[PDB]
Amino acid sequence: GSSGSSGMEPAGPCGFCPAGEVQPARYTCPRCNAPYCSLRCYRTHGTCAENFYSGPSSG
Ligand SMILES: [Zn+2]
Ligand SMILES: [Zn+2]
């Protein structure tokens, strides 16, 4: 299982999605490196966003 040089990592097939509805996860969770097709999954995969914003808004 070789590994690509360290620098720029390509996208990944959003697995969180339901079998069949596999989309190219162009983005990834900057907290858990989780490839998500869109914001929708980004929230389903995990609740990392909660402790990410880092703003005085959260309650
Ligand atoms: Zn998805
Ligand atoms: Zn995450």
Residue 17 in marked binding region: yes
The 8-class DSSP code of residue 50 comes to: G
Considering every ligand atom, which ligand is closest to the CA of 21? 1
Considering every ligand atom, which ligand is closest to the CA of 34? 2
Fold annotation for 1-59: Wheat Germ Agglutinin (Isolectin 2); domain 1 (3.30.60)
Under 8 Å between Cβ of 35 and 28: yes
How far from 25 is each of 20, 31, 49, 50, 56, CA to CA, in Å?
A: 14, 15, 17, 20, 30
b/e per residue 14-38 (b: at least 16 CB within 10 A): bbbbeeeeeeebebbbeeeebbbbe
* Ion ligand 1 contact residues with beta carbon within 5 A: 14, 16-17, 37, 41
Residues recorded for the chain: 59
How many angstroms is it from 25 CA to the middle of ligand 1?
7
Which technique was used to obtain these atomic coordinates? NMR
Spell out the domain ranges in the chain: 1-59
What's the CA gap between 41 and 58, in Å, rounded? Answer: 21
